[PDB]
Amino acid sequence: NDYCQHFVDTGHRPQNFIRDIRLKDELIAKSNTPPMYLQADIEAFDIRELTPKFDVILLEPPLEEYYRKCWTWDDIMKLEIDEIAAPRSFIFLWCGSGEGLDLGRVCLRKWGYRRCEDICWIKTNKNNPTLDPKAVFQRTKEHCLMGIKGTVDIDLIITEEPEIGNIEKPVEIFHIIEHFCLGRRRLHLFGRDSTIRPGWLTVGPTLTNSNYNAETYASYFSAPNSYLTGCTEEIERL
Amino acid sequence: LFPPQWICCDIRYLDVSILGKFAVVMADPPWDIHMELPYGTLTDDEMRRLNIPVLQDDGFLFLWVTGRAMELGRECLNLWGYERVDEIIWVKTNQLQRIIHWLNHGKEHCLVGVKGNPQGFNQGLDCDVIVAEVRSTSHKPDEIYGMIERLSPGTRKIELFGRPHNVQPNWITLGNQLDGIHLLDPDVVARFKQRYPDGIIS
Numbered sequence: 290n291d292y293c294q295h296f297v298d299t300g301h302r303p304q305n306f307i308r309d310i311r312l313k314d315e316l317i318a319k320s321n322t323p324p325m326y327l328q329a330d331i332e333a334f335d336i337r338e339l340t341p342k343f344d345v346i347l348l349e350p351p352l353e354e355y356y357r358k359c360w361t362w363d364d365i366m367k368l369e370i371d372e373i374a375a376p377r378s379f380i381f382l383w384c385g386s387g388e389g390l391d392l393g394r395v396c397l398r399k400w401g402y403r404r405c406e407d408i409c410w411i412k413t414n415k416n417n418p419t420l421d422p423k424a425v426f427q428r429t430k431e432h433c434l435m436g437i438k439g440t441v442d443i444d445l446i447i448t449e450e451p452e453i454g455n456i457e458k459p460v461e462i463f464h465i466i467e468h469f470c471l472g473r474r475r476l477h478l479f480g481r482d483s484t485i486r487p488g489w490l491t492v493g494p495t496l497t498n499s500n501y502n503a504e505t506y507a508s509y510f511s512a513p514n515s516y517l518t519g520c521t522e523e524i525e526r527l
Numbered sequence: 528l529f530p531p532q533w534i535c536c537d538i539r540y541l542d543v544s545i546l547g548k549f550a551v552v553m554a555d556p557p558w559d560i561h562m563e564l565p566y567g568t569l570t571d572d573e574m575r576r577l578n579i580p581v582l583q584d585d586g587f588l589f590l591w592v593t594g595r596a597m598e599l600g601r602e603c604l605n606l607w608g609y610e611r612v613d614e615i616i617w618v619k620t621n622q623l624q625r626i627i628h629w630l631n632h633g634k635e636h637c638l639v640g641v642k643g644n645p646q647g648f649n650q651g652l653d654c655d656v657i658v659a660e661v662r663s664t665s666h667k668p669d670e671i672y673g674m675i676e677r678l679s680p681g682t683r684k685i686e687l688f689g690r691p692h693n694v695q696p697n698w699i700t701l702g703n704q705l706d707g708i709h710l711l712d713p714d715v716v717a718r719f720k721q722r723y724p725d726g727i728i729s
């Protein structure tokens with residue numbers, strides 16, 4: 290069966306036909322810091338105020354292509370991500386499906402990372418069986434590039450395509466990230482009220498409330514908790 | 528000549544100028560990644576030096592990549608004069624449509640580059656995701672040939688680093704595991720005999 294010919298005939302995307310840990314999720318849940326969040330207009334904001342340096346950064350800039358305040362790759366590339374990343378550190382960059390697959394790799398290298406994974410969000414259209422001018426094909430997926438600096442899951446997320454105007458990314462990305470046990474200082478840039486999550490510091494322009502305090506935030510990682518992976522037991526007090 | 532054609536050769540040394548111009552180029556290069564490898568590989572500089580630019584005036588390049596070739600393949604693509612305008616994902620399944628360092632790999636990537644200004648291609652008929660069964664190691668899905676034919680029906684196409692199971696109508700296949708030379712296009716046959724009178728490509 291040729292699902293490409295089938296899509297041409299019926300409009301059902303080939304991915305429509307793909308047929309589809311607990312204790313670990315509990316340890317992650319235990320070591321999670323309380324959710325912390327800050328309203329900040331990232332274009333005008335000195336990201337150096339975001340301390341301490343982060344073990345993981347999830348970067349979800351609102352691209353023009355998501356809508357059919359947008360951020361161009363010009364804007365994104367000028368962010369000083371290397372100033373807030375820990376010496377050993379990870380990034381996850383939502384790059385969309387167009388020029389971002391190239392410009393996002395430029396960003397990663399500009400900030401000192403090398404790509405180790407290319408995670409593809411594959412969008413099924415089982416419920417509703419229009420292209421950018423240079424596009425050769427119908428674009429049915431987005432890419433989240435994983436980068437590393439310093440010294441269970443698969444690189445695919447399959448969900449139904451969200452409603453038009455809904456720019457949310459699949460929450461499965463947080464599960465992949467947290468399952469790597471990369472450290473407990475996790476920053477989500479351009480997060481929203483709807484993405485705030487325990488274990489994460491969310492910073493973005495549309496947040497309606499803030500609770501971030503740099504000293505309070507740093508107190509979560511003071512000794513004996515400075516190096517925890519976020520997948521181990523809490524260190525006992527008293 | 529519609530029927531399959533091929534040339535067993537070392538692609539580093541063949542004078543690809545004898546072959547003419549193609550609406551589509553596809554390549555599955557033996558990128559030098561990791562070590563060992565059950566086959567012969569090409570160094571990064573050998574890949575950069577491939578004479579891809581002579582093969583098209585206006586058309587599309589399909590370039591399979593993996594690992595660090597996701598970056599090197601973009602370099603070559605741009606160096607050879609293409610702009611990457613799409614990226615195909617082959618989701619690798621078993622016979623029951625189940626998907627087969629930090630993450631397990633469910634897919635392989637095919638960069639799509641454009642050169643010049645191609646006209647009369649049927650852009651947008653297919654989507655950028657292939658779901659197809661894995662076969663022998665490194666065997667790429669045949670669905671890509673149908674996608675490329677619907678995109679550019681009837682035109683001449685060339686595949687680099689193809690194996691015998693890769694030969695297709697309307698395609699000229701180059702690779703070092705092919706069996707001899709099989710050429711039928713008279714224009715190609717003439718230029719091949721003029722350039723290689725003794726049939727010795729070296």
Ligand SMILES: [Mg+2]
Binds near residue numbers: 314464465468
């Ligand atoms: Mg989970």
